[PDB]
Design a binder for this molecule. Structure first.
Ligand SMILES: O=P(O)(O)OC[C@H]1O[C@](O)(CO)[C@@H](O)[C@@H]1O
Ligand SMILES: [Mg+2]
Ligand SMILES: [Mg+2]
Ligand SMILES: [Tl+]
Ligand SMILES: [Tl+]
Ligand SMILES: [Tl+]
Ligand SMILES: [Tl+]
Length: 331
């Protein structure tokens, strides 16, 4: 009651014995501020007329919504002001953003300011995704500082604007969930050291793409619906917002899939600010995250807006699908 374990307190105490300049706390405190401001706009978006498009398109091809602009501006401004960052990569910006010398700190942040664009207008859960790297280079900060493999992440996670607003944060020792208290505008710890189940009973994929799926995905799905051992078939869930489907995978277990297909060699989701952050969360929770052929966190990106296939969740479910890919593997 009068001893609130806030996100700030947790990350300060975490980074205590480990020493540190304390800019990670600065960064996350700043991010939390933009997340609250996004949550409040979202929760009254119809009244504030924030539905509808902005009138523009993303890089490879994406219709930019009003809340994309708002959330993008908020995240960039708070990150800059935090004095903790030097390079920013956003889904909404064609090029990396370089922070001004005076406000530069040591971190590189890749983010999706608003994830779940197709679900905005129907009031389904949407979110914010981020991954944070330490700049390694010694030269002037540049776009290349963002082109690190996922395994180099120091922290990653997401905000979920669902039935409640939740900040899920993964760092080297594990995953923790903080719920926004709307009364005092603080993220409070509600789930400690989260670990995903070894095996789940939900599969999550858009079967609208059945016609384009590779034979391994096709086989796996058939197996969920017609188990060979007479076990009960898996239930299906696909909210359509990566943050919502991945969060459910984390807390209920199971598998989430956005694979490569006949029209999309690399899938749809973006490696730097969608796939890597979630793969990292999953791995810190004891889960797996693969493209079907390689670990997502091991990919070395060459494009900040690069796409990747992703299959993640409970280790025994992801493994079962890898076995099918392996079985189908060819010259
Ligand atoms: O409509 P589709 O192709 O299933 O795409 C849904 C995916 O697209 C995204 O909106 C990309 O931002 C994800 O949040 C989501 O998982
Ligand atoms: Mg977005
Ligand atoms: Mg997204
Ligand atoms: Tl977008
Ligand atoms: Tl969006
Ligand atoms: Tl995407
Ligand atoms: Tl995207």
């Amino acid at each position: 009651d009068t001893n609130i374990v806030t996100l700030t307190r947790f990350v300060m105490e975490e980074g205590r014995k480990a020493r540190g300049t304390g800019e990670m706390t600065q960064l996350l405190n700043s991010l939390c501020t933009a997340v609250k401001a996004i949550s409040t706009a979202v929760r009254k978006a119809g009244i504030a007329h924030l539905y509808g498009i902005a009138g523009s398109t993303n890089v490879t091809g994406d219709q930019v919504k009003k809340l994309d602009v708002l959330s993008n501006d908020l995240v960039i401004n708070v990150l800059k002001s935090s004095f903790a960052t030097c390079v920013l990569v956003s889904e909404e910006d064609k090029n990396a953003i370089i922070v001004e010398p005076e406000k530069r700190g040591k971190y590189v942040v890749c983010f999706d300011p608003l994830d779940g664009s197709s679900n905005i207008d129907c009031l389904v859960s949407i979110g914010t995704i981020f991954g944070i790297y330490r700049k390694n280079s010694t030269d002037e900060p540049s776009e290349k500082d963002a082109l690190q493999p996922g395994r180099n992440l120091v922290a990653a996670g997401y905000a979920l604007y669902g039935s409640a607003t939740m900040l899920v944060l993964a760092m080297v020792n594990g995953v923790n969930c903080f719920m926004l208290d709307p009364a005092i505008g603080e993220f409070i710890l509600v789930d400690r050291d989260v670990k995903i189940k070894k095996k789940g009973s939900i599969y999550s994929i858009n079967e609208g793409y059945a016609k384009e799926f590779d034979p391994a995905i096709t086989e796996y799905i058939q197996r969920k619906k017609f188990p060979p051992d007479n076990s009960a078939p898996y239930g299906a869930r696909y909210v359509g917002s990566m943050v919502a489907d991945v969060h459910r995978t984390l807390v209920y277990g199971g598998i989430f899939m956005y694979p490569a297909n006949k029209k999309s060699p690399k899938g749809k989701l973006r490696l730097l600010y969608e796939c890597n952050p979630m793969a990292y969360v999953m791995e810190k929770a004891g889960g797996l995250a693969t493209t079907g052929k390689e670990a997502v966190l091991d990919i070395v990106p060459t494009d900040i807006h690069q796409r990747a296939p992703i299959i993640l969740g409970s280790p025994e479910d992801v493994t079962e699908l890898l076995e099918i890919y392996q079985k189908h593997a060819a010259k």
